[PDB]
Amino acid sequence: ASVQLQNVTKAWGEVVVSKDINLDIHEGEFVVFVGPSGCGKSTLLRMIAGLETITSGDLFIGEKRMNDTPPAERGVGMVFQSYALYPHLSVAENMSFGLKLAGAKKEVINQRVNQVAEVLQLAHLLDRKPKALSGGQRQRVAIGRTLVAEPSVFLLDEPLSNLDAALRVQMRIEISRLHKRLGRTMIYVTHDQVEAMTLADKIVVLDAGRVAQVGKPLELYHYPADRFVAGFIGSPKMNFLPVKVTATAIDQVQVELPMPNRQQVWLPVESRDVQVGANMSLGIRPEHLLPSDIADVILEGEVQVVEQLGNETQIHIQIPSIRQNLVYRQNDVVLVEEGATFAIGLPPERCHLFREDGTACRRLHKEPGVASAS
Amino acid sequence: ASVQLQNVTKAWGEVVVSKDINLDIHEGEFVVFVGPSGCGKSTLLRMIAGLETITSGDLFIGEKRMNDTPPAERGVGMVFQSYALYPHLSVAENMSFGLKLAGAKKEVINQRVNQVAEVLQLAHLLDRKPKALSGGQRQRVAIGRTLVAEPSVFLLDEPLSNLDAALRVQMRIEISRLHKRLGRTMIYVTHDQVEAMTLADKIVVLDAGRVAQVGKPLELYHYPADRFVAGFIGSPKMNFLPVKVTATAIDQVQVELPMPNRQQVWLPVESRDVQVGANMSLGIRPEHLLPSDIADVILEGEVQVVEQLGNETQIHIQIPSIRQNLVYRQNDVVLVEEGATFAIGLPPERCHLFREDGTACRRLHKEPGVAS
Ligand SMILES: Nc1ncnc2c1ncn2[C@@H]1O[C@H](COP(=O)(O)OP(=O)(O)O)[C@@H](O)[C@H]1O
Numbered sequence: 001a002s003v004q005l006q007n008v009t010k011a012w013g014e015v016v017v018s019k020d021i022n023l024d025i026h027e028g029e030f031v032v033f034v035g036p037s038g039c040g041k042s043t044l045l046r047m048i049a050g051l052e053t054i055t056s057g058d059l060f061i062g063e064k065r066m067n068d069t070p071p072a073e074r075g076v077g078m079v080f081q082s083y084a085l086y087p088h089l090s091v092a093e094n095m096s097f098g099l100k101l102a103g104a105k106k107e108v109i110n111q112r113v114n115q116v117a118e119v120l121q122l123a124h125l126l127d128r129k130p131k132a133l134s135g136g137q138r139q140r141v142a143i144g145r146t147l148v149a150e151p152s153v154f155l156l157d158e159p160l161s162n163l164d165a166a167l168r169v170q171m172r173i174e175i176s177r178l179h180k181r182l183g184r185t186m187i188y189v190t191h192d193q194v195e196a197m198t199l200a201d202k203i204v205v206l207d208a209g210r211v212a213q214v215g216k217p218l219e220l221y222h223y224p225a226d227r228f229v230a231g232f233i234g235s236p237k238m239n240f241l242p243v244k245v246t247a248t249a250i251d252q253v254q255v256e257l258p259m260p261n262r263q264q265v266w267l268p269v270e271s272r273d274v275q276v277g278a279n280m281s282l283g284i285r286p287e288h289l290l291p292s293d294i295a296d297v298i299l300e301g302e303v304q305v306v307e308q309l310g311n312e313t314q315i316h317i318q319i320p321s322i323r324q325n326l327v328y329r330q331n332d333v334v335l336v337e338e339g340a341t342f343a344i345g346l347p348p349e350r351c352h353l354f355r356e357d358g359t360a361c362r363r364l365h366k367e368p369g370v371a372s373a374s
Numbered sequence: 375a376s377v378q379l380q381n382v383t384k385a386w387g388e389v390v391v392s393k394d395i396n397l398d399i400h401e402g403e404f405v406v407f408v409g410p411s412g413c414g415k416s417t418l419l420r421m422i423a424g425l426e427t428i429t430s431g432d433l434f435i436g437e438k439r440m441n442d443t444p445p446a447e448r449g450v451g452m453v454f455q456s457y458a459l460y461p462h463l464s465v466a467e468n469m470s471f472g473l474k475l476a477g478a479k480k481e482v483i484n485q486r487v488n489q490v491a492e493v494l495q496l497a498h499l500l501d502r503k504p505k506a507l508s509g510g511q512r513q514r515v516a517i518g519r520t521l522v523a524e525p526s527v528f529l530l531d532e533p534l535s536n537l538d539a540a541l542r543v544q545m546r547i548e549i550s551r552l553h554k555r556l557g558r559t560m561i562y563v564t565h566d567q568v569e570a571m572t573l574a575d576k577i578v579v580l581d582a583g584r585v586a587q588v589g590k591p592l593e594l595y596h597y598p599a600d601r602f603v604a605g606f607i608g609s610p611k612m613n614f615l616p617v618k619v620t621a622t623a624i625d626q627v628q629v630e631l632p633m634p635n636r637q638q639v640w641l642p643v644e645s646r647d648v649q650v651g652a653n654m655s656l657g658i659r660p661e662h663l664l665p666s667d668i669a670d671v672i673l674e675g676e677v678q679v680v681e682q683l684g685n686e687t688q689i690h691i692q693i694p695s696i697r698q699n700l701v702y703r704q705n706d707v708v709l710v711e712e713g714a715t716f717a718i719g720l721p722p723e724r725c726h727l728f729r730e731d732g733t734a735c736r737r738l739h740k741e742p743g744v745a746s
């Protein structure tokens with residue numbers, strides 16, 4: 001139902017957990033806050049819910065400033081970690097609970113419970129106390145509540161945390177579908193980049209309380225704004241090679257690889273604030289390294305680890321030119337033994353470049369799936 | 375240090391949490407017990423550790439029957455999501471909860487601790503306290519303490535459960551390396567098939583207390599013994615199409631697709647206990663469906679969902695021929711909009727076939743990475 005944060009800031013004493021954050025969440029939008037451990041995801045949700053105060057800035061749900069408004073009068077529903085049910089209430093009861101304080105026709109009440117039930121996989125245990133173990137089921141009960149009561153805005157704090165990988169996976173699809181049906185605004189929080197990529201219309205990456213970047217999944221993936229975002233989004237982390245810039249041009253930067261071979265390569269990157277001799281970080285995703293049959297900039301090394309996963313093979317390589325190890329991903333099964341000498345290709349159009357301050361030199365290579373000029 | 379379970383069974387009253395389980399774990403082997411929620415993973419570890427009794431069958435650690443043996447005299451060390459150290463802190467000081475309290479000399483406690491230091495990536499922090507945050511390394515010292523214990527076998531129950539996805543990922547690599555250095559026996563337990571695939575030399579899949587199957591990751595992946603294993607191993611679940619067998623032969627079975635087109639396809643599968651007219655389940659992994667440029671058995675439908683993940687694209691399709699939706703995985707970015715009509719190819723050599731009882735008709739197509 002439209003949520004806006006304007007220069008919102010949170011301070012506990014003299015520390016700042018949330019620094020001047022500006023976010024514009026539109027109606028029906030599914031937004032995900034992503035970031036490491038204590039980057040401040042929960043604090044944000046809490047400030048939006050009113051379970052925490054906004055030391056500065058304005059919060060705006062719908063069209064009204066909610067800063068000073070009781071949590072129950074904001075039009076938000078929330079679910080988190082390992083939510084606790086009302087022990088005396090049954091699953092069905094612990095599910096129609098919130099939709100009840102909101103006053104609702106039993107027809108609706110039941111309609112929703114049963115719907116949400118046969119989705120979160122619970123219809124068979126509506127009649128039963130929260131001592132339905134499994135915790136993974138109680139958590140599902142916790143979520144259903146918020147789902148059955150359809151708050152104008154959903155605030156879910158790591159809802160899938162207590163589930164098995166298999167369940168966690170099905171739940172995502174379920175939450176996605178759920179979002180397609182009812183088109184309400186939802187702010188979701190995880191520490192798992194995959195959930196983000198999978199659920200969001202818009203992702204907001206948090207780093208130590210600051211907003212590192214905001215944008216569509218593919219935007220964050222093809223064009224991370226800085227090293228932090230670049231190493232946070234991407235199942236197996238992006239590779240980073242320390243390089244030295246040896247030349248610049250318009251819409252093009254040349255750097256030399258740490259290889260005692262010091263091969264120089266031109267990268268179709270921004271070239272803005274970048275001077276010759278500067279030390280930078282070259283970034284290349286494991287999926288984007290090439291088989292090697294494709295010459296032009298080759299890296300050869302010793303296999304340290306080989307992960308056969310059936311659908312793909314992840315190979316860890318030790319490139320003589322400074323340890324690092326380089327992680328490579330090739331599709332399907334690849335037969336290589338540890339200790340073997342493996343080579344791969346470095347594709348310029350696919351590289352990222354970060355200045356010492358960690359900021360990125362905007363990539364000029366057009367990537368599919370992202371609105372681009374031309 | 376070699377662990378063997380022979381017809382081990384556990385019963386709580388009249389229920390059976392562990393049913394006649396037979397496992398042969400070799401020296402230095404890294405074994406993972408995988409299964410859903412309460413499939414019985416913890417009970418198994420506990421029986422091996424001696425924190426639970428074996429209602430029947432024999433347990434054998436090394437060469438001796440441990441059934442009736444106190445937990446502390448079995449040569450096992452057990453770790454479970456609960457890393458704790460000492461308030462007096464200090465890496466070197468820690469890692470010796472046992473060594474110091476029992477003399478063991480002052481030259482020995484140093485060699486063990488120093489042998490799990492740089493020999494674990496922790497020598498440059500041996501004299502460092504957990505006051506230097508280090509979260510993932512503080513996991514390595516907790517482990518290190520268990521290690522310096524020199525246990526014959528190593529137990530671990532969902533150790534990565536309390537970590538962020540990012541940490542969870544690095545920890546796996548760490549635990550793998552750790553296993554490469556010291557080559558002790560380790561029995562690991564998860565509910566996450568990915569951790570299994572990534573860590574194990576041998577995986578044992580548990581279903582409601584029974585052992586659904588034992589084998590190398592690729593064995594379980596290319597050749598699941600039954601529908602359960604087939605739908606448990608594989609990031610996005612394997613597709614299942616209800617089919618009707620229309621003909622058999624030696625090392626070959628023909629079935630007809632539920633398509634009102636009822637296209638018939640021969641599958642290089644076992645063909646053992648399988649009669650014409652029988653209803654079966656055709657299994658095909660999302661990664662194994664083909665682009666379509668490759669004709670021969672094509673399925674066309676309406677896109678329901680499209681997941682752009684940067685490294686790959688997962689497309690959910692509605693095939694007219696009976697709902698089901700079919701999940702497809704193509705590498706890199708694929709530009710398709712929901713509602714679009716997309717087609718894919720069905721590769722026979724890659725299909726699985728399950729009898730009504732859920733058992734699999736052994737695939738005959740040779741797959742890479744699996745002996746035989
Ligand atoms: N009431 C509080 N008082 C002091 N510090 C707090 C409080 N609540 C959270 N913090 C701190 O702010 C950070 C962010 O916590 P949140 O719990 O916001 O993090 P995340 O959801 O990203 O893990 C943590 O480092 C935490 O110690």
Ligand SMILES: Nc1ncnc2c1ncn2[C@@H]1O[C@H](COP(=O)(O)OP(=O)(O)O)[C@@H](O)[C@H]1O
Nearest residue numbers: 386389391409410411412413414415416417418
């Ligand atoms: N002390 C106990 N008393 C009765 N049943 C138990 C006990 N411990 C475990 N169980 C049963 O065994 C099953 C498996 O639990 P474990 O705790 O073995 O499972 P997992 O680690 O796979 O979640 C549960 O479904 C539960 O019913």
Ligand SMILES: [Mg+2]
Nearest residue numbers: 037041042043
């Ligand atoms: Mg939190």
Ligand SMILES: [Mg+2]
Nearest residue numbers: 415416531532
């Ligand atoms: Mg357990």
